[PDB]
PDB file of C-alpha atoms in Angstrom:
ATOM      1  CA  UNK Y   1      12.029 -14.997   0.983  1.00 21.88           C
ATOM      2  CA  UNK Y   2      10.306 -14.918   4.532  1.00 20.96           C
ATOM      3  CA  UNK Y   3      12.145 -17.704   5.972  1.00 20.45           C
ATOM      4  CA  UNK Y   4      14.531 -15.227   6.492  1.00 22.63           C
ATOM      5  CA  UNK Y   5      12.500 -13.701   9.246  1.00 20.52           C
ATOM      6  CA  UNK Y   6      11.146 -16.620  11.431  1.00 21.55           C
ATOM      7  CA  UNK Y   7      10.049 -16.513  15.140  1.00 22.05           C
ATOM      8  CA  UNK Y   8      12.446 -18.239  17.346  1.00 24.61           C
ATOM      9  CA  UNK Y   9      10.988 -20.158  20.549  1.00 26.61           C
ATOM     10  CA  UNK Y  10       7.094 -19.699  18.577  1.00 25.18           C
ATOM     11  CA  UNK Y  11       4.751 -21.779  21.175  1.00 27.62           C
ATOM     12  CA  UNK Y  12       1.942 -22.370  18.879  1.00 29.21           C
ATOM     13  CA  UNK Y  13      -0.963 -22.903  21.777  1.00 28.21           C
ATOM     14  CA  UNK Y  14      -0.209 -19.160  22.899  1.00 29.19           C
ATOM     15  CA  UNK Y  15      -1.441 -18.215  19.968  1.00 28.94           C
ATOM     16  CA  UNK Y  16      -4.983 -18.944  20.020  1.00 28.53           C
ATOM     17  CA  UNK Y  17      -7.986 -16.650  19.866  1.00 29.24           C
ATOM     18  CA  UNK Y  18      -8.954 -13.353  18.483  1.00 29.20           C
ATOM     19  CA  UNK Y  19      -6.894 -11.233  15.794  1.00 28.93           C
ATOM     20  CA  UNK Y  20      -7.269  -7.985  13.629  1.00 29.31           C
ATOM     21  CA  UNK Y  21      -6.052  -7.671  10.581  1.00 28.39           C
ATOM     22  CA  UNK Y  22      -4.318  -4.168  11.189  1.00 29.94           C
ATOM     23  CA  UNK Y  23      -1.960  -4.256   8.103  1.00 30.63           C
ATOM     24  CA  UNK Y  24      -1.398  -6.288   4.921  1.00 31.53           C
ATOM     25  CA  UNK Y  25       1.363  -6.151   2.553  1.00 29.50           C
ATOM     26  CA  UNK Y  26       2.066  -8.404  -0.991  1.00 30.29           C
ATOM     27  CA  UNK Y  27       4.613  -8.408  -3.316  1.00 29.61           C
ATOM     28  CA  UNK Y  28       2.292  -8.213  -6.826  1.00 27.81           C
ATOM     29  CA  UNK Y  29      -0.515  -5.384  -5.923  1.00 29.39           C
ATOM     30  CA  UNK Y  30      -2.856  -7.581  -7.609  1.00 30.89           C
ATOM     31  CA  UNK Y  31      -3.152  -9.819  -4.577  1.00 29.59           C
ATOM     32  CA  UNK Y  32      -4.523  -7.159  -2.295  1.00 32.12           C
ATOM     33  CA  UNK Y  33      -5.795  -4.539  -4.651  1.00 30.65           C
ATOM     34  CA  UNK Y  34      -9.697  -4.826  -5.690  1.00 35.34           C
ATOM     35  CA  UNK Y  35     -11.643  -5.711  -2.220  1.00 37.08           C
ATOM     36  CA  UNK Y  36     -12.201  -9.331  -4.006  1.00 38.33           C
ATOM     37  CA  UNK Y  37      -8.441  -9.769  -4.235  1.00 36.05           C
ATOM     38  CA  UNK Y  38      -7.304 -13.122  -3.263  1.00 36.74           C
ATOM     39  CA  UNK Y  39      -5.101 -12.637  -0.019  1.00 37.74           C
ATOM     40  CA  UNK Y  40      -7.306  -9.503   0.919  1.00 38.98           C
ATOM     41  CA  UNK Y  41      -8.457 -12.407   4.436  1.00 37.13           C
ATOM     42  CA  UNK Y  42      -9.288 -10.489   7.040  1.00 37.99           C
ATOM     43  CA  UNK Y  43      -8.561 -12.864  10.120  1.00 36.78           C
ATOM     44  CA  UNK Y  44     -11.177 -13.582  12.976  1.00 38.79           C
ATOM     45  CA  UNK Y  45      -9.045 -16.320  14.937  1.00 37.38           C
ATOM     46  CA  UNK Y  46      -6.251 -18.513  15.613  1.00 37.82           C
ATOM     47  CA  UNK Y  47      -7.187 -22.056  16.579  1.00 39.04           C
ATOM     48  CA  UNK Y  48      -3.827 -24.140  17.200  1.00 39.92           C
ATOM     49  CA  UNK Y  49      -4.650 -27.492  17.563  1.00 39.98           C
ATOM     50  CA  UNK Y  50      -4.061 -30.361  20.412  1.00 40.69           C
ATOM     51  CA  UNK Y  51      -1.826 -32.420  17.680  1.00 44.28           C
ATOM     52  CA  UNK Y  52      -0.381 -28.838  16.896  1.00 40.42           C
ATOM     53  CA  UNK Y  53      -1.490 -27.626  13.295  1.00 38.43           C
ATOM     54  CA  UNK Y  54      -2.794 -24.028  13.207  1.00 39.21           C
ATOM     55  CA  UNK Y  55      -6.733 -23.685  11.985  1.00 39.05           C
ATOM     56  CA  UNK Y  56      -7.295 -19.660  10.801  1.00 37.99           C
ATOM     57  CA  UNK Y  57     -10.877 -18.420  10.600  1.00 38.57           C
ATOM     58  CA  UNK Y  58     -10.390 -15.463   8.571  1.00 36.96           C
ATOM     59  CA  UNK Y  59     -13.976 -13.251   6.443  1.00 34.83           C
ATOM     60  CA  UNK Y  60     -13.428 -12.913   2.741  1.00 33.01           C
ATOM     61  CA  UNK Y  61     -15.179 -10.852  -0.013  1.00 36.35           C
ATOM     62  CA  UNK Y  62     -16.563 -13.270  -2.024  1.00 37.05           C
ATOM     63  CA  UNK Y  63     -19.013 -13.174  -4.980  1.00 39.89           C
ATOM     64  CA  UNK Y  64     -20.512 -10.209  -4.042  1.00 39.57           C
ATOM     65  CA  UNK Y  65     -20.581 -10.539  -0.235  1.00 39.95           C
ATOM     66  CA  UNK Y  66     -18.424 -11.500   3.066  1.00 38.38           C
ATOM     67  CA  UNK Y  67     -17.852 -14.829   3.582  1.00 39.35           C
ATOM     68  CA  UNK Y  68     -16.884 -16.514   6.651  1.00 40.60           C
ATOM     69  CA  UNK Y  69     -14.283 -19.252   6.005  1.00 43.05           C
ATOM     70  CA  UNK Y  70     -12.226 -22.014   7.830  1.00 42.07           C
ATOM     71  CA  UNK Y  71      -8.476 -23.111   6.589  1.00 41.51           C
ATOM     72  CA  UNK Y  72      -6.060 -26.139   8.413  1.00 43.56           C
ATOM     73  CA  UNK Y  73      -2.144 -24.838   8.318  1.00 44.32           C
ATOM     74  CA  UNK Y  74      -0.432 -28.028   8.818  1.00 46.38           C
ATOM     75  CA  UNK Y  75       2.450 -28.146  11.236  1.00 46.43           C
ATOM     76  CA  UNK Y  76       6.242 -29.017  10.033  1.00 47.39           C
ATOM     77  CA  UNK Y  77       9.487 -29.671  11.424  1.00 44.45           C
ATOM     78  CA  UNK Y  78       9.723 -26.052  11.939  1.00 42.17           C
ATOM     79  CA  UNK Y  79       7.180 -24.793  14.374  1.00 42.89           C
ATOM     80  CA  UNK Y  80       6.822 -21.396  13.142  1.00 41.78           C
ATOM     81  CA  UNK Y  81       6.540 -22.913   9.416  1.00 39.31           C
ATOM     82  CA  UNK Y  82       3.089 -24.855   8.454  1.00 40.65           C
ATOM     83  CA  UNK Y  83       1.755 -25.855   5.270  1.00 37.94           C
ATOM     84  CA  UNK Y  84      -1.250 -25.136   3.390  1.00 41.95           C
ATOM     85  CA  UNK Y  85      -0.845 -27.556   0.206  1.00 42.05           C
ATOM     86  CA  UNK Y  86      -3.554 -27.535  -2.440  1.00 44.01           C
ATOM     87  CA  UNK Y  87      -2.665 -27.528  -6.276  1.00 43.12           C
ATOM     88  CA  UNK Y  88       0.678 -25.468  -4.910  1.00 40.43           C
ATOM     89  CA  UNK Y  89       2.913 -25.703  -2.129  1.00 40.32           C
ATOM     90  CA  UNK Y  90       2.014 -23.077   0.068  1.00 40.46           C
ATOM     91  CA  UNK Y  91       3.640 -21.896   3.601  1.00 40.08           C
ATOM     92  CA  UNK Y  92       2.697 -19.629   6.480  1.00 42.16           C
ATOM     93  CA  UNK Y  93       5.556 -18.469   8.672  1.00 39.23           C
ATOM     94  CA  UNK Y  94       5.440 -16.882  11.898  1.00 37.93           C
ATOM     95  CA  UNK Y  95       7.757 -14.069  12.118  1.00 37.29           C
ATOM     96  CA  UNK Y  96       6.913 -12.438  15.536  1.00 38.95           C
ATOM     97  CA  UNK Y  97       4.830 -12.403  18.446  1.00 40.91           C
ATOM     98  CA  UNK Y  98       4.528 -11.261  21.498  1.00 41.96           C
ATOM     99  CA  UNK Y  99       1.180 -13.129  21.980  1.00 40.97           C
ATOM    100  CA  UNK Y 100      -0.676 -10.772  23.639  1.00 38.46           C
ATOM    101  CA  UNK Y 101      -0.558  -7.435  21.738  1.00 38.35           C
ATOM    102  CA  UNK Y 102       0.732  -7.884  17.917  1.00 37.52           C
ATOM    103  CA  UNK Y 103       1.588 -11.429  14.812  1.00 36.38           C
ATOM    104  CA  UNK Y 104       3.199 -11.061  12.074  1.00 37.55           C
ATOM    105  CA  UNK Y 105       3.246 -14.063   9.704  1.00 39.34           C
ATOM    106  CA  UNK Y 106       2.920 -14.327   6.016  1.00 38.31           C
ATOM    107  CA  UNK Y 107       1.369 -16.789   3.267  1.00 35.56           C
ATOM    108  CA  UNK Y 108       3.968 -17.780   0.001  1.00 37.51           C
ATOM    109  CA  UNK Y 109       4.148 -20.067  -2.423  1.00 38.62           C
ATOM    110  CA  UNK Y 115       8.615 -15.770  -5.549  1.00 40.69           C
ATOM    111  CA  UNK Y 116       4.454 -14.593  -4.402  1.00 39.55           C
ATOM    112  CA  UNK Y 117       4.379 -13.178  -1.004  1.00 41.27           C
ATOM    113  CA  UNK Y 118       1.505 -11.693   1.377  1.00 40.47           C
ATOM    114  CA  UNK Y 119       2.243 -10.886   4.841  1.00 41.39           C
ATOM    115  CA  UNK Y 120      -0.084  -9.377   7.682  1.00 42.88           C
ATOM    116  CA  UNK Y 121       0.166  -7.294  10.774  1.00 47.89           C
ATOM    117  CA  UNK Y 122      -2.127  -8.981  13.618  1.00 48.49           C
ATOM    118  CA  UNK Y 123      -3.231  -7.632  16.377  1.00 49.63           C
ATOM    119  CA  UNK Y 124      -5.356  -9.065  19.770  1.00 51.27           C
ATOM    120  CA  UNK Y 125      -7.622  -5.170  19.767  1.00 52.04           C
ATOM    121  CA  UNK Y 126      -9.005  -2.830  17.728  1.00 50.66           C
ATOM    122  CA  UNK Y 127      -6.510   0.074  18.050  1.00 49.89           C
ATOM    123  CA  UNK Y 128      -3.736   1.088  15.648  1.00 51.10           C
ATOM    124  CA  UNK Y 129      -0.696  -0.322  17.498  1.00 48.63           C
ATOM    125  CA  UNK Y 130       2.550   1.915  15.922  1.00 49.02           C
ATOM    126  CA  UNK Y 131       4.863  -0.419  17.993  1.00 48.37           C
ATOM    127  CA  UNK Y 132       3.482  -3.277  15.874  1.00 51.55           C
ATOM    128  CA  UNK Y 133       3.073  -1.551  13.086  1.00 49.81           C
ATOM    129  CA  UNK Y 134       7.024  -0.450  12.811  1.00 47.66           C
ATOM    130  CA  UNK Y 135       8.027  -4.089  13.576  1.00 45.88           C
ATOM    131  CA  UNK Y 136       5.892  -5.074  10.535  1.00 45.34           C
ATOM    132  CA  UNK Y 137       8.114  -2.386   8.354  1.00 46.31           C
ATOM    133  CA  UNK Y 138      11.387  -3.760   9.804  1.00 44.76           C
ATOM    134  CA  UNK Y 139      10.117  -7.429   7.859  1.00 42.11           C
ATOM    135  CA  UNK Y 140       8.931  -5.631   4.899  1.00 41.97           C
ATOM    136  CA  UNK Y 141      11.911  -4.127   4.480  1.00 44.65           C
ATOM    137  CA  UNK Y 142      13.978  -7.200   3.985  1.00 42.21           C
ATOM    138  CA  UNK Y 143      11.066  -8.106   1.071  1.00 46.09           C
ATOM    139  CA  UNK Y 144       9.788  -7.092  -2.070  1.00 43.58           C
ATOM    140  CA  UNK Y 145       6.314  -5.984  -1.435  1.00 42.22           C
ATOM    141  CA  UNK Y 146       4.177  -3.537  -3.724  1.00 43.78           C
ATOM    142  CA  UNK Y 147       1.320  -2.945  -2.058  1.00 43.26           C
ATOM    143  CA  UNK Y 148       0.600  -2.355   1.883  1.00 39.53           C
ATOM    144  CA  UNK Y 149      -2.839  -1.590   3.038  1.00 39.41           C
ATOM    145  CA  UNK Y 150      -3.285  -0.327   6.783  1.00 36.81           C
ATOM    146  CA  UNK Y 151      -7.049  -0.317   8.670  1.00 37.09           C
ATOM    147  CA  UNK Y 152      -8.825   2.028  10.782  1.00 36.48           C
ATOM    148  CA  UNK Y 153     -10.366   0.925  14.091  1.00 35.35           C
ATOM    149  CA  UNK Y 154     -13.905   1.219  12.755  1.00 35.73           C
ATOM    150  CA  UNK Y 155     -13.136  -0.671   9.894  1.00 36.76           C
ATOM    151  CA  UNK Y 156     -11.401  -3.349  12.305  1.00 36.01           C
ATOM    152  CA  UNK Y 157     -14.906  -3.618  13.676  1.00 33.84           C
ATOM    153  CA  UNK Y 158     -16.942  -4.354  10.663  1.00 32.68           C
ATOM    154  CA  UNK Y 159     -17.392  -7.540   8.389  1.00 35.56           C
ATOM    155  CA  UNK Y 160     -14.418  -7.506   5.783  1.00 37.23           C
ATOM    156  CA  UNK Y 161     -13.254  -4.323   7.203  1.00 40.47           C
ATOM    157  CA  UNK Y 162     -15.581  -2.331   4.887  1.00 39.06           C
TER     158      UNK Y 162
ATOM    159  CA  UNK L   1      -2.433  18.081   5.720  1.00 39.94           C
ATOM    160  CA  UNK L   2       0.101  18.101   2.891  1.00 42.18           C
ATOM    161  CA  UNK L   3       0.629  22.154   3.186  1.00 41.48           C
ATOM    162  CA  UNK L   4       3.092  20.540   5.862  1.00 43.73           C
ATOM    163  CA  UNK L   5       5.958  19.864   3.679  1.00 44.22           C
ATOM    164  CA  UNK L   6       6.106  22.163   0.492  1.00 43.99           C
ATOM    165  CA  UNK L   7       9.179  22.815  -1.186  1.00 45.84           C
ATOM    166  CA  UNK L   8      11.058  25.955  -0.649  1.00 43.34           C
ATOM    167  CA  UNK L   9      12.408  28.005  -3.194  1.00 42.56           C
ATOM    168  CA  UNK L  10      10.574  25.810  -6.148  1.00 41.38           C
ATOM    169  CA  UNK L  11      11.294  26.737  -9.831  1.00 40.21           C
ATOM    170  CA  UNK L  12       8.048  25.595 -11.733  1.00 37.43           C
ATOM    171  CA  UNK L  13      10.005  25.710 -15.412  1.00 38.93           C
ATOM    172  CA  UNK L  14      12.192  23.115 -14.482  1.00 40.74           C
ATOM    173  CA  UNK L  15       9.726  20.277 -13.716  1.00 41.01           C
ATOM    174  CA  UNK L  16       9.084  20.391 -17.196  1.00 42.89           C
ATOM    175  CA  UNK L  17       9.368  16.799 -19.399  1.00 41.22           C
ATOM    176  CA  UNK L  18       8.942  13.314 -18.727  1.00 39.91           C
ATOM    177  CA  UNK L  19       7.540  11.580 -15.099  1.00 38.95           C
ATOM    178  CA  UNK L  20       7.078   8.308 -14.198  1.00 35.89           C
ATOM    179  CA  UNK L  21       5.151   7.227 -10.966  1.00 34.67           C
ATOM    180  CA  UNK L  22       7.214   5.111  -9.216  1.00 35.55           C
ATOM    181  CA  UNK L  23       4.977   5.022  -6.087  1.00 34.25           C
ATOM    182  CA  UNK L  24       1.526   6.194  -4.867  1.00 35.53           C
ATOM    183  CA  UNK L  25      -0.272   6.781  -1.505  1.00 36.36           C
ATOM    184  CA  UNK L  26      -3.314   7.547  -0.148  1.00 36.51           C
ATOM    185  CA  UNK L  27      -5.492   8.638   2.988  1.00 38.05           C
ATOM    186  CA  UNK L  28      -8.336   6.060   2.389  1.00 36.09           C
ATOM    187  CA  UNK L  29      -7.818   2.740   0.826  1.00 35.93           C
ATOM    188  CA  UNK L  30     -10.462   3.193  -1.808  1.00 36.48           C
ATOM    189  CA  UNK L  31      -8.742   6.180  -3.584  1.00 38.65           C
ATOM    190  CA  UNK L  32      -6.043   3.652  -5.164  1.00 40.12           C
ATOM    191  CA  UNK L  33      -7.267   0.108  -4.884  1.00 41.23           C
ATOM    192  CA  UNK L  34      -9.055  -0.850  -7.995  1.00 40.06           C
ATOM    193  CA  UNK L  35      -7.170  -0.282 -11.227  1.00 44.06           C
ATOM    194  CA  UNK L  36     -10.072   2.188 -12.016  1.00 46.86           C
ATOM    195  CA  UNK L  37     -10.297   3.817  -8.499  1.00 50.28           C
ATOM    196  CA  UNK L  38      -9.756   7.359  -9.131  1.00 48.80           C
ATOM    197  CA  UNK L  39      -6.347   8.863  -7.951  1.00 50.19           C
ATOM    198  CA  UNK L  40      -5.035   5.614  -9.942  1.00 53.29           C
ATOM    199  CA  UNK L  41      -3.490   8.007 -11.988  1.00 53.14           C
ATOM    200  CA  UNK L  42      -0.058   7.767 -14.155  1.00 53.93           C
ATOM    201  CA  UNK L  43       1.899  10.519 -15.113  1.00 53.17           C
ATOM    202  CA  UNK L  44       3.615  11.196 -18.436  1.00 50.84           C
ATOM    203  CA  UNK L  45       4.626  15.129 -18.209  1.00 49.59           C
ATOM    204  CA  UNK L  46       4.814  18.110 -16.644  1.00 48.20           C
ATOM    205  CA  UNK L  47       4.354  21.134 -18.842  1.00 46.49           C
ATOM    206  CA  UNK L  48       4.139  24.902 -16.901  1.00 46.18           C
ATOM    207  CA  UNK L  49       3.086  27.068 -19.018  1.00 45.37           C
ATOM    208  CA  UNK L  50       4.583  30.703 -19.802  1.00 44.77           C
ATOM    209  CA  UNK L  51       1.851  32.648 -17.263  1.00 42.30           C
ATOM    210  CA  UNK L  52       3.036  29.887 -14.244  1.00 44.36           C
ATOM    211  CA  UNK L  53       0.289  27.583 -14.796  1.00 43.85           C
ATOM    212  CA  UNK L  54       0.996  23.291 -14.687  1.00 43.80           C
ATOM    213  CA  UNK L  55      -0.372  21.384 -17.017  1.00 46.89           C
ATOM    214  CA  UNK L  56      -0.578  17.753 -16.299  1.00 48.13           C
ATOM    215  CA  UNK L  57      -0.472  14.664 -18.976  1.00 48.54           C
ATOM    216  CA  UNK L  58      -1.359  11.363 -17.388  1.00 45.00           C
ATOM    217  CA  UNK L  59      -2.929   8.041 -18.450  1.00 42.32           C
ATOM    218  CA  UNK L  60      -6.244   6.779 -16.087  1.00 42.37           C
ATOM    219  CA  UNK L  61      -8.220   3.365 -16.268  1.00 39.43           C
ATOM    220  CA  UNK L  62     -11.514   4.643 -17.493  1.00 41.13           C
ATOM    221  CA  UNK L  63     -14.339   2.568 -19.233  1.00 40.91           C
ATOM    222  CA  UNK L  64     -12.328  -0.907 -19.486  1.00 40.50           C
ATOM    223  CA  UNK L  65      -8.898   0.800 -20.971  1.00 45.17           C
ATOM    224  CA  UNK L  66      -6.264   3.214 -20.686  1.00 47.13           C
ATOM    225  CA  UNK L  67      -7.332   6.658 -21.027  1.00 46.41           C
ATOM    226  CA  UNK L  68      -4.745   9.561 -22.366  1.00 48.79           C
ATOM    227  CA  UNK L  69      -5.955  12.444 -20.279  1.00 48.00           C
ATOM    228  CA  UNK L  70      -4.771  16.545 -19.603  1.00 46.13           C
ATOM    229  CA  UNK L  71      -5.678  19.175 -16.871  1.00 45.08           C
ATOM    230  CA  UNK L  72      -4.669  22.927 -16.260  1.00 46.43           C
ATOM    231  CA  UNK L  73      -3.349  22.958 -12.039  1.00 46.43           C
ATOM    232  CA  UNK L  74      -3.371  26.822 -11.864  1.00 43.86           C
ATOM    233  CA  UNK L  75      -1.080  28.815 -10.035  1.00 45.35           C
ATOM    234  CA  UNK L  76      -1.524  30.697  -6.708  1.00 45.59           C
ATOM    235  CA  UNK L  77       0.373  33.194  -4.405  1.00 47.21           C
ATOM    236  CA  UNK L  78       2.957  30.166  -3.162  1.00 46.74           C
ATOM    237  CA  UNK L  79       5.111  28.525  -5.920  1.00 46.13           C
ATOM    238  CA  UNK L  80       4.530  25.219  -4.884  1.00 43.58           C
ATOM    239  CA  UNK L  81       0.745  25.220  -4.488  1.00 44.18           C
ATOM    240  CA  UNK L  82      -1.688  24.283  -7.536  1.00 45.51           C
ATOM    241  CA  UNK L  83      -5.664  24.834  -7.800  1.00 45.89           C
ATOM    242  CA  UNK L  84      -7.790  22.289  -9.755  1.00 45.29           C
ATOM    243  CA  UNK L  85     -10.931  23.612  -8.666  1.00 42.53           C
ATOM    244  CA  UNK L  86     -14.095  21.617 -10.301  1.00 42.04           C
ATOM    245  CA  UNK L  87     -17.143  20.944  -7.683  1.00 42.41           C
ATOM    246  CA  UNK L  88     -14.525  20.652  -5.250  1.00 41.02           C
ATOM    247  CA  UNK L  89     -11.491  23.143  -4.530  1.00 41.35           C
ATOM    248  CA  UNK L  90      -8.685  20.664  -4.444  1.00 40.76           C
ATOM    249  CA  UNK L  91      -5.043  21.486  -4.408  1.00 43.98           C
ATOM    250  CA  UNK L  92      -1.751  20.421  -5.894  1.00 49.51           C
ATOM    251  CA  UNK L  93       1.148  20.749  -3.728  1.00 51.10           C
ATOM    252  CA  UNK L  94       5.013  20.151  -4.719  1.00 53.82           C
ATOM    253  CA  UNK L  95       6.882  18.345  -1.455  1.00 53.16           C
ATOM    254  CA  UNK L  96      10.043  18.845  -2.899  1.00 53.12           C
ATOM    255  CA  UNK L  97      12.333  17.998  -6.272  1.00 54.73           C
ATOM    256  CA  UNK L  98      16.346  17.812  -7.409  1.00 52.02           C
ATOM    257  CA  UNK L  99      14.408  18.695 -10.999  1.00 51.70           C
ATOM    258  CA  UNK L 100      16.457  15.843 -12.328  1.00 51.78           C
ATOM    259  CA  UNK L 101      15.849  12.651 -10.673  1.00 50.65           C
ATOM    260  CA  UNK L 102      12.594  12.633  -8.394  1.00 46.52           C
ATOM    261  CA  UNK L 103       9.586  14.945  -7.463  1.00 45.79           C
ATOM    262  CA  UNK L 104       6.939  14.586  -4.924  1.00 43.54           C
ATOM    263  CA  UNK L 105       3.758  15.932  -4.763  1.00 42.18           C
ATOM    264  CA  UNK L 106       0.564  15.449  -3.149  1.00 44.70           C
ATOM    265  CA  UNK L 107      -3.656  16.110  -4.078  1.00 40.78           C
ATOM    266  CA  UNK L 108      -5.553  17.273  -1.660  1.00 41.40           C
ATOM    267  CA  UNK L 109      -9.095  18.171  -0.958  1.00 39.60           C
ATOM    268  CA  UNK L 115      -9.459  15.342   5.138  1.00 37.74           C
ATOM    269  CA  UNK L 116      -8.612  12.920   1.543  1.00 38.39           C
ATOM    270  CA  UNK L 117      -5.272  12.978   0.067  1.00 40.03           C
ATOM    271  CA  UNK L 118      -2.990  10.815  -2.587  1.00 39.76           C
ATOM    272  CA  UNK L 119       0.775  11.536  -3.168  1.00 40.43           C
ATOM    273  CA  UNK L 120       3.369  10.440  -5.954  1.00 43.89           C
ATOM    274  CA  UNK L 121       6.773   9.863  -5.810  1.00 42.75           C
ATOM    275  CA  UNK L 122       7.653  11.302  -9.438  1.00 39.76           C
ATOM    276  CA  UNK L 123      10.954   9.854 -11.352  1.00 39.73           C
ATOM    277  CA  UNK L 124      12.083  10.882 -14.536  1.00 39.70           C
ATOM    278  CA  UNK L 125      13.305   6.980 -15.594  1.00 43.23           C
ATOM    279  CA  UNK L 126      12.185   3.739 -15.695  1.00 39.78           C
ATOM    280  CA  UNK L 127      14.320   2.841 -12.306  1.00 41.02           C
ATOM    281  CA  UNK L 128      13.530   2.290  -8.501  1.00 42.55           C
ATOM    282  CA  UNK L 129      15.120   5.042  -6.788  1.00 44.28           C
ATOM    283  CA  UNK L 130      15.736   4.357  -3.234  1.00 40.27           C
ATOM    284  CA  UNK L 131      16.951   7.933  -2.364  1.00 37.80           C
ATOM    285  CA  UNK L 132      13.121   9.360  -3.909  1.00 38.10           C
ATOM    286  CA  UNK L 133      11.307   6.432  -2.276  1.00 40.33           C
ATOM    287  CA  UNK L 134      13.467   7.457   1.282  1.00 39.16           C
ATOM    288  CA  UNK L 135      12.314  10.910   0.999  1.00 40.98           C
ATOM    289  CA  UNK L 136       8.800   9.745  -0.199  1.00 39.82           C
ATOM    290  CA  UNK L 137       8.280   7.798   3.382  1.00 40.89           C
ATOM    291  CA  UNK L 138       9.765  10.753   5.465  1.00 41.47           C
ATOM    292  CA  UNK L 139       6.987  12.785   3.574  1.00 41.02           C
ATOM    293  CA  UNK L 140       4.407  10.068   4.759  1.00 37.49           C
ATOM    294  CA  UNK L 141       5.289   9.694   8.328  1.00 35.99           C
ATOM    295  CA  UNK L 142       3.547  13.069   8.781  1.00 34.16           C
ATOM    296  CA  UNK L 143       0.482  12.077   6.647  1.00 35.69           C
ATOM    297  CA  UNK L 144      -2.376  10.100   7.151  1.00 36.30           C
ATOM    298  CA  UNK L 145      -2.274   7.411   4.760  1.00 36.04           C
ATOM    299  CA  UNK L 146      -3.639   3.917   4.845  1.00 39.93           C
ATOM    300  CA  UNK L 147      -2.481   2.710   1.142  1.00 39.43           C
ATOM    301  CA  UNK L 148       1.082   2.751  -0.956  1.00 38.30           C
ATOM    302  CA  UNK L 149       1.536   1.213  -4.335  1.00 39.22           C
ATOM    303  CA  UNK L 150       4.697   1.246  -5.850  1.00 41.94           C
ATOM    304  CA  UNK L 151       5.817   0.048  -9.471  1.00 42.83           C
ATOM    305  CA  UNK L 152       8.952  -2.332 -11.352  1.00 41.97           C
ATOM    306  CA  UNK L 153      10.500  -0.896 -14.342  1.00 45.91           C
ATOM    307  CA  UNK L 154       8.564  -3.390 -16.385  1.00 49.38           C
ATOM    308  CA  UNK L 155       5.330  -1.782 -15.349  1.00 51.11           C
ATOM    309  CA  UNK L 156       6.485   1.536 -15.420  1.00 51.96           C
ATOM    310  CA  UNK L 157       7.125   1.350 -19.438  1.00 53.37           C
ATOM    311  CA  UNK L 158       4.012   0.225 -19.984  1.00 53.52           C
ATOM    312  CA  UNK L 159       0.277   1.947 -20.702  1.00 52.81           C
ATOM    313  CA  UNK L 160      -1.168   2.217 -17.391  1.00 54.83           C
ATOM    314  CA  UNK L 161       1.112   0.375 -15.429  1.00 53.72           C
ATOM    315  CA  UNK L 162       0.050  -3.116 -16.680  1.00 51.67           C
TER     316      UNK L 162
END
């Protein structure tokens, strides 16, 4: 359960603009393991809204190729909490920011992904061990880690 | 570089018997993300042989299925150090064992995937504490680990 780790005080606009993908962890390996997994996004941008929902640009491997694709995370009661409802009941929760440097925030539905965001191309270990503090109080399987060329390149190939 | 953290004192007889991999890690992504990629490997046993030798039984996706497979890692001066030398000269290396509960080790060629080794169908916190210490010092960028359910089954399914 990620609610357990929720950012307190989260001002959504702040947000905004470009993120790496620096780190991804999930709970079944399966959902980051081939490069076509299904939470293996690889975010471009965070575009909050006016009325205050959260649009994510994010690449994806997809049918042999990278594909650039466009999701709406609908705001709650809970600003760090937003909603992506299809068939399921899905959340993204922010757990931490410092909006300038380093996001964490992860995707579930008990099926978790999480991610390690950061503004830069550069391995940031002060992000990176704040990321391992939430992990720890989760059951995740697999975590996956990028290099700054990789950070650089469509779908981090 | 693995030759880092060998284990001092090691007696190769007493790794002998039955391994499970709780938990795998790797210096590029690729070496463990599909269920074929190739240091996807699950071990069975640990047999040295009478001359010092190691021979190692795990299971591999190969072909669409789960492959029984054996190699010879031959000894060298240092206890805890193993040749399997094909095109490549790549090395074995024991981190350290309690012979009873948990062993690490590490393959090596800079590419490199360790284990945590347990010799039950459990997740050991102590082996997966010492398997992170291990990792601090190493340059990896992917970590699987398994459930019990998983663990007792052909491959890891």
């Amino acid at each position: 359960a990620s609610v357990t780790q929720t950012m307190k005080g989260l001002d959504i606009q702040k947000v905004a603009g470009t993120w790496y993908s620096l780190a991804m962890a999930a709970s079944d390996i399966s959902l980051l393991d081939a490069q076509s997994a299904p939470l293996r996004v690889y975010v471009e941008e965070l575009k909050p809204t006016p009325e205050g929902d959260l649009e994510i640009l994010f690449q994806k491997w997809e049918n042999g190729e990278c594909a650039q694709k466009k999701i709406i995370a609908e705001k709650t009661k809970i600003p760090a909490v937003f909603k992506i409802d299809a068939l399921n009941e899905n959340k993204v929760l922010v757990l931490d920011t410092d909006y300038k440097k380093y996001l964490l925030f992860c995707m579930e539905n008990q099926s978790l992904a999480c991610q390690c965001l950061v503004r830069t191309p550069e391995v940031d270990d002060e992000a990176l061990e704040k990321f391992d503090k939430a992990l720890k109080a989760l059951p995740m399987h697999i975590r996956l880690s990028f290099n700054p060329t990789q950070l650089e390149e469509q779908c981090h190939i």
